[PDB]
Amino acid sequence: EAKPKFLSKAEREAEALKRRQQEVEERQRMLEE
Amino acid sequence: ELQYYLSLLNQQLPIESQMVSKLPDMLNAEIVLGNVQNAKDAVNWLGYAYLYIRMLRSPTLYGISHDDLKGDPLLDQRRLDLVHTAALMLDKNNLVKYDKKTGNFQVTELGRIASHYYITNDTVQTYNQLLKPTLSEIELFRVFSLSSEFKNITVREEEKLELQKLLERVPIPVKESIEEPSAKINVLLQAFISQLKLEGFALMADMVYVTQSAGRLMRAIFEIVLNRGWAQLTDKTLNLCKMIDKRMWQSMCPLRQFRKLPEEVVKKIEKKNFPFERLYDLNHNEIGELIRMPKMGKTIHKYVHLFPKLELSVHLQPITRSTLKVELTITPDFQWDEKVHGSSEAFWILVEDVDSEVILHHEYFLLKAKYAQDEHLITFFVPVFEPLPPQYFIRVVSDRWLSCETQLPVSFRHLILPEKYPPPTELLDLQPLPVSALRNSAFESLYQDKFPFFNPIQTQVFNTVYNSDDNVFVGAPTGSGKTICAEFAILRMLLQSSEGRCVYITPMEALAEQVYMDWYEKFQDRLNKKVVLLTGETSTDLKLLGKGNIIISTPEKWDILSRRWKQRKNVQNINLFVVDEVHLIGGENGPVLEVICSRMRYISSQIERPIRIVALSSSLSNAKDVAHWLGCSATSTFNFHPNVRPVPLELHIQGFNISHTQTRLLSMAKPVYHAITKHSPKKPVIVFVPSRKQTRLTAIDILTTCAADIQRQRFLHCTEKDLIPYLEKLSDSTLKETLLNGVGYLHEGLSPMERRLVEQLFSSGAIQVVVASRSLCWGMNVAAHLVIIMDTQYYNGKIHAYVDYPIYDVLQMVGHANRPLQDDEGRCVIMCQGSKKDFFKKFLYEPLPVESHLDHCMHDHFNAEIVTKTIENKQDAVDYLTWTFLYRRMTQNPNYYNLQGISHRHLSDHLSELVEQTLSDLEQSKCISIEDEMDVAPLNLGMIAAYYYINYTTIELFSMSLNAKTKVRGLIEIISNAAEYENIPIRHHEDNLLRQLAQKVPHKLNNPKFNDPHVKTNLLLQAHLSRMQLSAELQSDTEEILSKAIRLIQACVDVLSSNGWLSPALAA
Amino acid sequence: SSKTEWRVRAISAANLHLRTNHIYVSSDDIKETGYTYILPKNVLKKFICISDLRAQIAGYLYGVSPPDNPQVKEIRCIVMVPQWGTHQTVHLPGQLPQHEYLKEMEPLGWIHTQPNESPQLSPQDVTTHAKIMADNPSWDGEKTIIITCSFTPGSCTLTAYKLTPSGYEWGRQNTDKGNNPKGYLPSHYERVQMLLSDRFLGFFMVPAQSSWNYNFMGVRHDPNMKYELQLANPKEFYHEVHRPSHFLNFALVYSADREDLYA
Amino acid sequence: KLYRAALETDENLLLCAPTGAGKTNVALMCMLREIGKHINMDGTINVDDFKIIYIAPMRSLVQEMVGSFGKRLATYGITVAELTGDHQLCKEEISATQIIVCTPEKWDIITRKGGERTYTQLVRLIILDEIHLLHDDRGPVLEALVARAIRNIEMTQEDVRLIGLSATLPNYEDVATFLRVDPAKGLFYFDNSF
Predict the structure, then answer these.
(1) Which residues pair up as cystines (chain D)?
(2) How many CA atoms lie within 13 A of D78 on its CB side?
(3) Listed residue (C187, C79, C169) closest to C133, CA to CA
(4) Which of B569, B623, B649, B747 is the most buried (most CB within 10 A)?
């Protein structure tokens, strides 16, 4: 949003891991297509 | 021929001057060396040679009749005719621009390359008319063989069979026929490069002479291709020069250039198609087993480790939308040896586009043996156009070693370039506001005798400054009258409230002292207002803020008061916040001013009182981000253009192709005097010198250049009777002798009273030249017509490199020559290197954008926020960092702030990572406590660092280096090794004085380093404690050390009292 | 001969720079239904000056579609794999290049220089494209094109060509390398629209170990040899490193030795 | 006969002596007179305060003169070196040594490139040996070097002792006037009988 919500290092690492897993799933779906 | 042999063996053969053949070459060499500039100087240089004496003694041998000798006894007409013929030969060969009207000659790059390589005029003309950027390697040999050095070399009919045999063995094909001398010279060069055995002795001598000419010809061709910008032609010329120097083909082995390698092992390595990079990864046994030679495997491994191959790393940062800053870190990955590499290794680094045809940035790097095995960082400016390439290529090749080149692809695919800059606020063509436009008569009485009408930018800003109270961002160049707008805003704040509290923050201490001295005569003398200046003492600063209405301060002085704004009610009850020169908020004292502005913007939105913020700075391109970060409105943003100054500035750039800084400073003395004589003959001039000791040398060189010509003592517009009371007050006899001729000097080592006397002598018009140091650029209360800034660099001894001058000091030196009534315009001649000419030309007319560098110095701001109970959690720290200028600069330039996107999630993750790094740096230094990785608590060390304005690293060093049994000799070394002593100036010729003073100190230093600033601070503290004698440059550093040594001793005493130590506290 | 023809080829390639100043595109018989080619001018100029008038030079073009425009394909990267082609065919290696730069763009096909301009597509090129498509599943039968950049007098005539599924099947089934092999039909190839541009610059990839040029040494070239590509500018066909045999062949002092001259 | 003009007098001398008449002795006396200004009684000699340039036309003759200067001035610590290599190597050899034996073409190239501008104030002894090639192909290069030296002595007022050695040739008065040598004390014209 407008106000930047501060997160921890572990929460940011978990968000980056979830984004990488979503990108890997999108790449696997694109490869299957 | 028996008579002439009888003439030389019996003293009967007079020596006849044959200087008419190389007279245009000598004229071009004298024009490139700076000895001759016009036709009169060329005639005077020709008259001092032996050719004029031979023409005067024997005119019949020189082709002069008796009537020409009778009509010209001094041989001036024949010398003028020879100078005109040499000028016509130089202009026809495009070597030097020679005008027939005035007779002045300007040396071009082709003439300088011909003089530096001893090339002829016809060869230079053939190289200028023959070399194309789309030329291949086959045409390059034909262009090099068609020079004027081989004009007398003929193709003999007896050597036609040898040329036909060598035509089938040369690796470079020749397009010309066998009867042409150019193809014969190309075949001879191919035979000398490939070490082909010849048969004819005269053909071998012609090939040796052709190679001895072609070495300098290829060097001049490589210089001309580097000056022209053709990247592929320069690469081919460098390959041809390396093949001519190493006497080997480009496809040969890299060990052939080393004379210690056997020929049979080199032939066995060349027989196997293996790259040279694969041999570096192998060991001494694997390289011996791969080439089937285990005895020579260790020698091959030593030759691979001794071959020049360095690792290059690229760091790109887009500063503007058209140019970026590229930092190249070069790490030597080879064993440096004096028998292989020597004292230094020269390399050429060329950064070009994806097409590899236009060299965008060409430079040289001389890695010395003393600076070997260390990564050197070279900063360059790379331009970028609207068709942005996916990647640029930075090729660093070896200038002496063949087949030693490292290529770095700098990718621009994921480069987050900033957006387009908004147009600046143009000055409307309105009527100038008179002195009667103001309401208060006391405010108009302080500016009636100064000027009857204000500036047009001041007339446009008076409607938003005097008739309003909002935050106004005034981006005006140095000399446009920002002080008049600041005085109008102060008068509006005084008319709105008579008991107001105005605070004017300026980064430079000398500029703040000048502003305080101006306000003492303008606001305190004519309006009777309490105008005070803040000091470095926190006890008197509160009384000066409570009793003063106009407080001039520094960001380093106001950061101690803004850190306790919740407790101090006088800082919360402010009426006006003026911030002068905010454009220097991205350099020295840069994040401190931004942190003070963010603290003022946070306290203005939390104390129920909107303070009038007036941010006066230079013309910035990204002024919208600075207006949004300071709360300025869109109508109050008076960001003018750099070309909208009242005094028109004519900016000239003198690029000198000199790698050494001392050689460039020695060579740029006479062009500086030539530019001073050509631009402003009867006007005062200010010469910006690189160093303090170089200012007296530049003044002596200017005095010698003035006394060499007929205009002796032309810089002294006054008489000696008016300067005799002025020269009697100076201490240096050399400075008084230079000021007697009209050339004053000013440096950091000079006295302040002597500097004030020199400024009063230069402002009155007695002297015409003022050689001021680079540190006295901002601290100069004078305005001249010409500003010659010579060699804008500094030889830093802490890194031992010639670091370039910052843009803020260059802008201050450009704006220092702002004469509104004394001169109609202002000349600014920046004489620097050729690589820094494009950046200085781009940062002069275009507005310089502001870039927040608060990420490198966020630890002290985080400690000050946590100690004042402001940033108590992670969200509070994120909200405090979001209100600063770094959050506004990250949204405009993500790649400059090391971000990967302008999205909210990526910026939030970057802010969380920065907050976590700051919390880890605070917890590792025992300055803060992290409760559940979310809450921040100030510790004792962090509160002691924020109270005495100390860094976290210095507080951690004082906490980990002071024990319960410490002494004074250990406490002095602990205070000298603090973070505040790392900013000590380290220049050339300073290690010998430190080594001489280290033997007289009362306390010895365990393994002292001549390049470390902590050892210099310890030596200065030992000299100040023992009251020993020192130089002026040492005393100028000792005073800056002792200015913070009291706060360092107070922090050490607080750390000793907090740890429960009585005897180390008493020793401190 | 490879004795005097090498010099003629080098001289002709020296003047091949001017041939890039005049580029013509055979915009005719375009289906106007498939994706368009947006090959940039810089990449074409680079690939035209690194080709020989006798030996055909081929390179794999990979790119991506412009945003919000799926009806066009922009070839943004060209990689020159080490190959040694003749005047009528190209012996491209069987290893499909892979790199970090190419990990974001799909293969757009191959571009082969043609020393002569022919009205009909070469059956050998069609067969090679079909074999490459069958071997490498990455290349599609409806997204890969064969840019037959022909050579013209004073000009570099360019033309795009796409293989029909029937043509791909015929090329995969056929294995003879004759001049007019059986199964080649005019319906096998279909020209596609190709437009040059000067708005987006192209990327060039060259092998990290060896050079892209391999016509000067057919023994070193291997049809199954693996290749490692990296972002670099390819060298010319008649380069010093392209022909090691012509360079390192000569075998290894009483003349006039002038020392300390003016240099 | 010219001992007081090369050791006791620092003026520009013109020695017109034939080949084999001890032409190196006058250059050694001029080098000893140039080193006599830097006494250094605490040490041996101050070699970082003066420089002696030796203009030799042949490279082997320049190497022989550098070897003779290294063998003769070994007790004084005068570093005799040959200016060769690149521009940076020649600048390092000029900044690291005192006696520099080089060609007139190499000295002209170093003056035009700027490698001797930083060490121009320390060079106070210019020994131009074998000036009898002033009509040869090395003529205009040595003439331009002498003109640059005369312009530096007239403009920058740098007193440089110029010792020009030539063979027994006529019209030596013009060569003495071109080298700023005095006709009485600086001019030494020896015939073939010497």
Answers:
(1) none
(2) 26
(3) C169
(4) B623
First-residue to last-residue Cα distance in chain B: 94
The two three-digit tokens of residue B504, written as one number? 């004017």
| Residue B1031 to residue B749: CA distance in whole angstroms | 8
The distance of Cα D168 from the centroid of its chain, to the nearest Å, equals 19
Q: How was this structure determined?
A: cryo-EM
What secondary structure does DSSP assign to B653-697, as a single string?
Answer: EEEE--SSHHHHHHHTSHHHHHHHHHH-TTS-EEEE-SSHHHHHH
* Shortest distance, CA C241 to any CA of chain D (angstroms): 28
B103 Rama sector, left if φ>0, alpha if ψ -120 to 50, beta otherwise:
left
Report the amino acid identity of residue B1068.
A
Cα separation, C155 vs B497, in Å, equals: 80
Q: How far apart are CA B949 and CA B1054, in angstroms?
A: 13
User: In DSSP terms, which residues pair with C162 in a beta bridge?
Assistant: C190
Show the tokens assigned to D4. Answer: 């007081």
In angstroms, rounded to a whole number, what is the distance separating the alpha carbons of residues D146 and D127? Answer: 11
Amino acid residing at B357: E
User: Between chains, do D109 and C260 touch, taking CB under 8 Å as contact?
Assistant: no
Task: Please give the helix or strand (H or E) that residue B8 lies within, else none.
Answer: helix B2-8
- Do chains B and D have 3 or more beta-carbon pairs under 8 angstroms? yes
CA distances to B145, B208, B682, B1007 from B1011, rounded to whole Å, are: 51, 49, 45, 12
- On chain D, the residues whose CB falls within 8 A of the CB of B370 are none
Give the side-chain half-sphere CA count within 13 A for B486: 27
Give the up-direction half-sphere exposure of residue B710: CA atoms within 13 A in the CB hemisphere.
2
Asked if B913 lies within 8 A of A9 by C-beta distance, the reply is: yes
> Is D71 annotated to bind ligand?
no
Q: Find out whether B948 and B958 touch, Cβ atoms under 8 Å.
A: no
Ligand-binding annotation for B742, yes or no, is: no
Q: How far apart are CA C228 and CA C81, in angstroms?
A: 9
Closest C-alpha among D117, D118, D100 to residue D62:
D100
The pairing of beta strand B637-639 with beta strand B685-688: unpaired
- Please indicate whether, in this complex, the C-beta atoms of B201 and C248 are within 8 angstroms of each other: no
Percent helix, strand, coil in chain B, to 5, is 45, 15, 40
Q: How many CA atoms lie within 13 A of C173 on its CB side?
A: 10
Measured between alpha carbons, how far is residue B810 from residues B414, B583, B591, C44 in Å?
A: 32, 12, 20, 44
- Which residues sit opposite B533 in a β-bridge? B552
Residues 6+ apart with CB under 8 A from B449: none
Contact list in C for residue D105 (CB cut-off 8 A) is: 260-262
Name the amino acid, one letter, at B295: K
Which residues from chain D sit within 8 angstroms of residue B12, using beta carbons?
A: 170
Residue C219: closest CA among chain B residues belongs to which residue? B273
Asked whether the beta carbons of D140 and B18 are under 8 A apart, the reply is yes
